[PDB]
Amino acid sequence: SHMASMKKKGSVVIVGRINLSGDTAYAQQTRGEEGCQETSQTGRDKNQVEGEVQIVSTATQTFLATSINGVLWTVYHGAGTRTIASPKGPVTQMYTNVDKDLVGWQAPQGSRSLTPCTCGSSDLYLVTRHADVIPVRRRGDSRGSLLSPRPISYLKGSAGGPLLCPAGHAVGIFRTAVSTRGVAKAVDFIPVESLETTM
Ligand SMILES: CC[C@@H]1C[C@]1(NC(=O)[C@@H]1C[C@@H]2CN1C(=O)[C@H](C(C)(C)C)NC(=O)OCC(C)(C)CCCCc1cccc3c1CN(C3)C(=O)O2)C(=O)NS(=O)(=O)C1CC1
Numbered sequence: 630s631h632m633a634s635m636k637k638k639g640s641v642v643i644v645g646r647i648n649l650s651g652d653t654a655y656a657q658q659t660r661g662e663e664g665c666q667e668t669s670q671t672g673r674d675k676n677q678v679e680g681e682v683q684i685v686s687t688a689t690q691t692f693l694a695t696s697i698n699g700v701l702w703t704v705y706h707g708a709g710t711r712t713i714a715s716p717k718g719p720v721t722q723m724y725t726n727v728d729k730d731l732v733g734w735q736a737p738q739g740s741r742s743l744t745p746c747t748c749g750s751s752d753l754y755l756v757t758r759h760a761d762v763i764p765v766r767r768r769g770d771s772r773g774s775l776l777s778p779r780p781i782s783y784l785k786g787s788a789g790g791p792l793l794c795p796a797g798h799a800v801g802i803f804r805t806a807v808s809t810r811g812v813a814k815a816v817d818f819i820p821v822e823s824l825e826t827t828m
């Protein structure tokens with residue numbers, strides 16, 4: 630009831646990226662934890678952004694965000710309704726859809742966007758926050774099976790990351806693991822068409 634002392638949640642902050650530009654996929658950190666906490670509070674992030682897949686953090690969570698069609702997309706269960714930190718201060722979401730577990734902000738200057746897939750191919754590749762590239766066979770509109778199942782620990786923190794087709798187009802945004810006894814045999818994702826509809 631004490632309005633004057635009510636806090637505000639911080640912004641989502643870009644803290645690194647998954648580098649896919651060369652022959653080797655690898656994670657790069659661009660901001661440490663202390664800088665992250667400060668930048669989340671101010672919403673002012675002057676660091677250079679590059680690439681398609683960003684590693685992002687709040688005060689309490691870390692996950693991924695993926696640029697497609699000039700929008701940096703991620704999961705609502707990570708970002709909520711938060712702004713994203715940017716060189717000019719906090720930027721408000723331009724898309725929010727709790728029903729799809731989806732949010733988006735205008736893509737940061739310097740980022741590159743993936744192109745939505747129109748191949749209609751079911752051989753996919755999930756990119757994790759550790760830059761693992763995991764083959765996934767598409768099994769429905771929003772499901773795919775891991776060719777090599779993994780403990781959910783290996784996938785944790787990768788929601789918001791991409792599933793890509795063989796040509797490197799965006800097919801979906803990783804949302805949940807389909808897990809039994811802690812082993813992810815499959816994943817659920819927001820299909821890129823659903824992004825395109827939300828747009
Ligand atoms: C561990 C790697 C996982 C990718 C990951 N995501 C998760 O942990 C999400 C968050 C939460 C639970 N969950 C699951 O994956 C659970 C699980 C394994 C934890 C047991 N699976 C499940 O319920 O399958 C059941 C299934 C039927 C497939 C759900 C479909 C419904 C899909 C759905 C539709 C509409 C709205 C909402 C949902 C799900 N939703 C809101 C929501 O909040 O989901 C993550 O890494 N998160 S993270 O660590 O990066 C986090 C910091 C951001």
Ligand SMILES: [Zn+2]
Binds near residue numbers: 750796
């Ligand atoms: Zn494609």
